[PDB]
Amino acid sequence: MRLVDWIDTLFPCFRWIRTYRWSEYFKLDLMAGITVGIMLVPQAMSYAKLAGLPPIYGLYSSFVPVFVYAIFGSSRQLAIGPVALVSLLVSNALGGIADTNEELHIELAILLALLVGILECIMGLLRLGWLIRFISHSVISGFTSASAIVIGLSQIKYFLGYSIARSSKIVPIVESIIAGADKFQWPPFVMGSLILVILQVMKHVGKAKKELQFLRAAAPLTGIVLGTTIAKVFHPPSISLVGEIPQGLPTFSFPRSFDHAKTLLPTSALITGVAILESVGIAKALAAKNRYELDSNSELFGLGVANILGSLFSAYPATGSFSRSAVNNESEAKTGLSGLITGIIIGCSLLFLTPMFKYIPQCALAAIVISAVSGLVDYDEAIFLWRVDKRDFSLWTITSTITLFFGIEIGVLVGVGFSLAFVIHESANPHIAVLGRLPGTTVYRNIKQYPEAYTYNGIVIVRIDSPIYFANISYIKDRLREYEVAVDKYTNRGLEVDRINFVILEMSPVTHIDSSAVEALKELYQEYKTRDIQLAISNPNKDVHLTIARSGMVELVGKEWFFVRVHDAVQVCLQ
Amino acid sequence: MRLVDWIDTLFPCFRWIRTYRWSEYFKLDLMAGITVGIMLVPQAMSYAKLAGLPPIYGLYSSFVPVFVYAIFGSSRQLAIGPVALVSLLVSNALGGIADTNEELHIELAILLALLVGILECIMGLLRLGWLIRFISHSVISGFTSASAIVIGLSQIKYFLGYSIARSSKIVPIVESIIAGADKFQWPPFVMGSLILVILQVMKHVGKAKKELQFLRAAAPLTGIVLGTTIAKVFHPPSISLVGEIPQGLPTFSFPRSFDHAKTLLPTSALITGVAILESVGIAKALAAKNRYELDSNSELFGLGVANILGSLFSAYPATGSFSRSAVNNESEAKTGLSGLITGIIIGCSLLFLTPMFKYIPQCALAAIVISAVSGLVDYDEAIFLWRVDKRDFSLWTITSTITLFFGIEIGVLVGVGFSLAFVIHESANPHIAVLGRLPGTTVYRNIKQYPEAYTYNGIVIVRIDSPIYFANISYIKDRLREYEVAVDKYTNRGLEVDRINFVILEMSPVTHIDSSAVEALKELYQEYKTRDIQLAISNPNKDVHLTIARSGMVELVGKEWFFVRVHDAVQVCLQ
């Protein structure tokens, strides 16, 4: 194994190091990295506050994994760090375990990051990511919208100024807000409302214009730069600051709370599922847009390695960001260096900007989180689903409502269960076509023509428009037994009639068959002999023919009933 | 609603009452009922002993539900009562809950029967039985074989003569047997071995001959008639008798142990799943053999009603029997009256034969259970799978080994999970064909001919041989993006080359498309415009065309790129 291949195998970053056009790529990467870091620092602190951890642990979650991802990540525009959904899930798990320790929370979050990284590395090495991508996008969209509403209603407590009941359901949150309304304060609410209005106005102006689009990245910072100013001029009494923030880079430390690890598998999987469904999707979309190759397994392995190293350096789970990756995308980011620069910015903060961070009001961070999650309430997809596919709209509405009123875990379980139910329903109801004229197709909808001869009395030609395996064998057995039922009805009448003498199976679209398929075929052949019906096979696939010959069906039904076309099969059936 | 329709709707039994040919049907039904009752009484007591309940509760489980099933059951040959697998599952649940109460066991079993009946009625009314039939037959066969081995190794303790450790795993059972080998007794082992040998010889002789086939039904009784005789002549000291058995029909009593009901849902579902997979399968096979209609939903409703009434009359869950239903089948049973007569026989025992039952040795019942489950070790299917389908053989072996060494619940979970994994793998990897000549098909395997013109430079014709929905949309997106990757590779070379200008989709086999399909199609069209590739739709289905028009794809890509055939599409692409 030479170095040129071994290095590329272990370090995917070199995939863009060798093909690096310095002149334009360096300037574009530097600008994109600076922009993403500026957008990220306040967002990192706000998301850390959302998860229940002290704000500094957001910056850690952006420092070490980013440097790791830029070395082990396949995507060249994806931005790695805290996100709203993963922070919400981490907060959910920690609150379900620890109440007010403020010290077990940190260790639990770091252990959760380590478990998520290990699960991601396992699912990337084994290439088991396809086991999750069966979940419909409507379910994910509804769950994300409900999570966004829950996040906003949880963060409104900083605007109100009094602590509210901590829960993931809307009803207890609203009940607590109503109960505590007697402790309302005007200064924090006014500050939060003004900051949120300014942030949303800046974001809308940036998205409306094509050239003045950097405001989206400068919106989270500017609000703080605004809010702190009022905190340093008028000094409102009822506002709260983030307090002292430790200064310095995080140090190496193995997790010490493995005793709760078994409690964290249900969350560690869930977060990992998000990375399979959202982060990998963002990476693939960006790769398709930017004309480079990407695979869903190496990306998961890179995310897992980044999470593992972040856990080793006091970080909580970090995945791809819908907002930051986009902002990187229109910043003309070319390689993964834009990540490294971003990380460097974080490091600079951890060395120089922490003393100035203690004057940031908490309502400003709450407003930043609210602005970030306002774009996650994705009702446009709900309208689109209502217009196009009402089954998908029903799935979206059910998932959103259940996640809103019941827990996050209940909503996730309902969404996954409904997706599995619909997958099983589709697998268990294959399309079966009753063919008419020999070079023809389904008579019910496709072709109604009569080229002087369309169907033959006594012969039924059936095509199974799918591979036959254990999931759909029962439906096929029932459909083929309908002809026996028709024969029984004919023989049970008061007059002698029999219009089913031969049944021909078109197995040309049948890609493959398993043992259940040949067993059922033998059973139906025996039942047809009981009913005096002849079974024929028309267009066996090579693999299908080999399986049929191995199972002994050819000897049971006779070699003379196996053909290569429908024309000769029907011709010998008439004779 | 007239009586002729209402009565038939509520009471399916009348389906065979109206069409009843007295002369032959009465004699055949009477003989079949007597035969099944004779085979059932000892089997009922033996299975009740297997479940951990006192033997009499087997007879109850054959008395009231049978009379109910004959009124509410759709099958005319199915025999309802205790079975080996359901008894094993009931014993597993009870031992997991109650250790040696011998009184909470009865109430727990009756409550389990009520819960099973309610779940079956719910799944029959809602017609949700298709949610379970995706499980492969190999998984069920392996689980049943492992359960049979576990049942035999649990029942060998009566042969040994000393109590062994109660578990559902082979290793603790063998360890306990080795530990207790110092308490071995010769009389019970000799009695059990002789009874088992006689039973197996009788069963083999009955199955070998065509006319002397009643011995299979007389084997369980004869052994008792044998064993008791030695218990009444030589009186061995170390043998154990079933003891006093209460006399009389069971009385009405609602369950009183609802407090454990939530613990019993995981078992109540599992047993119900068995009824969906095994009992309904037996009913459908018998109906197909005997030339009458049967549906999988009314049968589940009848089983649920029978279970509910049995629970109301002190019975534990009862489903269809592989052995007794067969014995009914070659006994020329025609209607459901054969069930009623069988039940009557049970009633006679409960009125007259209970005093004579106290002399039955326990080793005789153990031998009966061992003989009953010896036929459930279904290695013939394992050999068949090894010969035909090695994936199914691997599933069978994994399920059997895990159920043998680990718990029943772990084996069930592994089997269901592997079946789901394979269903998802099949759904997520649809077949996509690269067509050659216009009235042609897949070029890789199907057709290699060259009718003077087969493929065109610059044009790729792709057919998706499946409906497009949320499960397989990712694979289709990747397959369609492979052409973009090829274009990128062509443009990244040292020479100017571009051999992908048009991509045509054959959507004739695409039965239907959902919202995810049209969203992905729009995304791929936009990416093709980025790569300067034209997207065309060749054979849209009527529903597919309607969905495409509703989603706005026709306006986005242009109406001029929608056709009805591949010939004209390629003709306009060349021009």
Side-chain angles (χ1 to χ4, degrees), chain A residues 550-567:
Chain A
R550 280 211 304 262
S551 66
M553 183 177 176
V554 170
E555 294 294 328
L556 168 77
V557 308
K559 181 69 176 177
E560 61 274 26
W561 294 114
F562 276 81
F563 315 92
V564 298
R565 296 173 69 245
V566 65
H567 300 66

Side-chain angles (χ1 to χ4, degrees), chain B residues 12-296:
Chain B
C13 65
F14 285 96
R15 279 179 59 201
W16 49 263
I17 292 176
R18 292 180 179 91
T19 62
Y20 184 75
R21 294 178 65 88
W22 171 276
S23 68
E24 302 172 356
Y25 286 1
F26 186 114
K27 67 182 290 294
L28 293 179
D29 287 342
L30 188 71
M31 284 315 296
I34 286 171
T35 297
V36 167
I38 285 175
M39 179 194 211
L40 165 60
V41 170
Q43 276 198 339
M45 293 182 286
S46 303
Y47 293 150
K49 275 291 293 293
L50 169 63
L53 312 169
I56 185 63
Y57 280 89
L59 295 182
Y60 297 161
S61 185
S62 299
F63 178 50
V64 169
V66 163
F67 285 76
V68 177
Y69 184 80
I71 303 172
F72 293 106
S74 294
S75 189
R76 301 174 190 172
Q77 287 69 240
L78 189 76
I80 285 304
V83 302
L85 187 57
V86 165
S87 294
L88 170 68
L89 299 176
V90 163
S91 170
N92 193 234
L94 299 202
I97 296 179
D99 52 357
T100 44
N101 289 335
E102 189 159 327
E103 182 65 26
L104 190 60
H105 273 255
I106 291 158
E107 298 182 2
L108 279 171
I110 295 165
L111 174 72
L112 193 57
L114 175 66
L115 296 170
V116 163
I118 278 169
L119 280 177
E120 293 185 344
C121 274
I122 280 170
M123 296 274 290
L125 274 180
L126 301 182
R127 312 161 209 210
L128 283 164
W130 51 267
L131 267 171
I132 302 299
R133 304 182 206 285
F134 75 92
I135 303 170
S136 67
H137 180 64
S138 309
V139 159
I140 301 164
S141 176
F143 172 72
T144 302
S145 306
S147 291
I149 291 172
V150 165
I151 288 163
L153 280 185
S154 292
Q155 294 290 283
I156 193 66
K157 76 188 175 188
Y158 298 100
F159 283 21
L160 297 177
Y162 54 88
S163 190
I164 70 174
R166 186 269 186 189
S167 288
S168 175
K169 312 173 180 67
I170 301 304
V171 176
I173 294 171
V174 176
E175 285 176 12
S176 58
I177 288 165
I178 294 165
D182 63 358
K183 297 167 279 179
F184 187 71
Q185 289 85 17
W186 269 5
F189 193 79
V190 166
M191 197 177 258
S193 179
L194 294 174
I195 289 172
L196 181 61
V197 160
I198 291 297
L199 263 53
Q200 273 185 347
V201 159
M202 286 176 71
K203 174 170 74 171
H204 273 49
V205 166
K207 185 183 286 185
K209 271 76 176 175
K210 305 253 182 180
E211 297 180 358
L212 204 65
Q213 74 185 336
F214 290 103
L215 295 180
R216 281 182 55 207
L221 171 63
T222 298
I224 295 171
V225 162
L226 181 67
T228 300
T229 299
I230 297 89
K232 296 198 85 67
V233 167
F234 300 91
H235 300 288
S238 57
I239 63 166
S240 181
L241 320 177
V242 298
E244 293 82 3
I245 277 174
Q247 180 182 333
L249 308 177
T251 58
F252 189 90
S253 290
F254 269 93
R256 274 92 53 84
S257 282
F258 273 95
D259 291 331
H260 298 269
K262 295 176 184 178
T263 310
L264 292 170
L265 277 296
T267 298
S268 303
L270 173 56
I271 287 169
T272 299
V274 166
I276 295 171
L277 290 174
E278 293 179 354
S279 166
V280 171
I282 300 167
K284 276 188 291 195
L286 290 173
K289 279 180 59 65
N290 290 280
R291 293 181 184 271
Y292 65 93
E293 298 217 29
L294 190 148
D295 56 355
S296 312

